Design a protein around this ligand. Sequence first.
Ligand SMILES: CCCCCCCCCCCCCCCCCC(=O)O
Ligand SMILES: *N1=[C]C2=[C][C]=[C][C]=C2N2[C]C3=[C][C]=[C][C]=C3[B@]21[O]
Ligand SMILES: CCCCCCCCCCCCCCCC(=O)O
Length: 572
Amino acid sequence: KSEVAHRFKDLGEENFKALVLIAFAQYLQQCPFEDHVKLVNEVTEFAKTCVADESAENCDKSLHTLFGDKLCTVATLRETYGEMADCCAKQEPERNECFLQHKDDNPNLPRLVRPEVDVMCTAFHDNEETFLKKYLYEIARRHPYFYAPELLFFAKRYKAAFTECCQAADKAACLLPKLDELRDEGKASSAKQRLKCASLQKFGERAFKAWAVARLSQRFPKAEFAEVSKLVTDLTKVHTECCHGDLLECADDRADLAKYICENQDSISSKLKECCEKPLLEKSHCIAEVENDEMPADLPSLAADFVESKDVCKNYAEAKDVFLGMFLYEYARRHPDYSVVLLLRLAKTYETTLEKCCAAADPHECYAKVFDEFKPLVEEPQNLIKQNCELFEQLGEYKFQNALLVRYTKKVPQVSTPTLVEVSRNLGKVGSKCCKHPEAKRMPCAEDYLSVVLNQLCVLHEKTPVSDRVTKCCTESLVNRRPCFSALEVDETYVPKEFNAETFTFHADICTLSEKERQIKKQTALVELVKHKPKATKEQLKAVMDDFAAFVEKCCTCFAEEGKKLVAASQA
Ligand SMILES: CCCCCCCCCCCCCCCCCC(=O)O
Ligand SMILES: *N1=[C]C2=[C][C]=[C][C]=C2N2[C]C3=[C][C]=[C][C]=C3[B@]21[O]
Ligand SMILES: CCCCCCCCCCCCCCCC(=O)O
């Protein structure tokens, strides 16, 4: 079975010529684009010889072998990959394992910098195949562990924005907003894939399955616990393998899970019809982002089996993870409106309760009212979402972001100004995205988007530690991470920042700037305003903000004239 030829079929020549490009670009991050093009063309030509004759020359070697063979022929030594060239002296599965250990992950590559809209649409027109292929090359060499089929999914959406906006009226009003959402979603996926690999190693796979049972029970409410438990086991085995870095081994386990799910749709979900009729690449991908199946009508209460029962301590003791997983599965399938972390708080609370009750003379009397403990935990994110979405409606996205700047700078003023501006604007975005949902779908939307922003804040703070309270909340636990950040009181031991005079100086270049960039600096100064006087309160801050609005809108030169009056007047 010639694997290079079989891969070429059922996957398509176009997807083959793109995955081979992403694959080699993830290893040879230093080699130029045109050098990569020949290698993809050479592998494509060689694959075509195996397509025309499966038992031809060098067509009997498997995927890792021909990959490793072609990779060890590029004068890899002395060209950055000196150590990676030493992998050639090994053989499978040591040579490929050696290749994975030498992915740079942090290559000293310049910021990509997008060209002008007219330049891109012209380059996209005159040479579309070369234009898009350079896009895959430049992104794959900077994200060496980004799952290649997933990176290919973004390339299609990248091309869809160019075909529509390049033949339009105001192209920049069409293309540029699509590219930013595309680039933002690309960073979110990259950080999500890493957060899940780090969560697997830091906290162990016992807690990883708990996250998977809850999410899968919400996704597949019409599935038995045994099916959900098997899907969680296989899904964990896939993530454990895909975090090693090997694309080929990750893809095969990822395709076997989709095949099993499509063969057992009648015992998993009713919403996997059009999902399972997609090709190999999209099948595994679409199932990951599948809508929750309809909840089974007339589901009994969890009072019977988990709090009343007759004897439940015996059931919990023999399997202190299965019985907790059955409670999590039954609670999650009934509450698709809860976040995954909320359901884990209820289970962990139900866990700590049983161990204190089953360690008592009358365990039943100890756990007789365990469900009263869940009400405060369910109402805590609900009140936070409603209090913040309502404050978002009466403010708009911008003024909601500024209310978050003041609130979070006063909590941790030690955080750098560019990080406080970035995190607060992204936290305002989850308001513009999730408050447009009803209460039945607001908590999961917030959980998914907050997990992206809160992790981005942590990885920035991890590389440059600054606050102990940010460090504790960032390394506590992924279940208690959000309640940790929301429980931060304002910093009382913080000494006010010194009045840097130039920081509050503006120069009328902000008059004609950029709607984002103009308010980036308008929000940067607001952070520096709060850092200088951390005891200003909203009334005085709304006064200085109102005084700045009249100073900026009118005097737009005078920025030094009226500016000096503002600084002295604000000193109050
Ligand atoms: C975001 C891209 C990650 C790439 C590696 C993913 C490895 C594991 C993904 C395999 C899942 C296949 C679909 C499983 C169906 C479960 C749906 C769900 O994830 O909630
Ligand atoms: N992702 C995500 C997350 C976060 C935190 C913790 C954990 C986790 N995990 C698990 C699962 C299941 C299903 C789907 C997805 C997922 B992940 O990986
Ligand atoms: C910089 C500190 C960020 C703190 C984030 C507080 C934002 C609160 C908004 C409502 C939180 C909703 C969380 C739902 C998921 C969960 O149960 O934690």
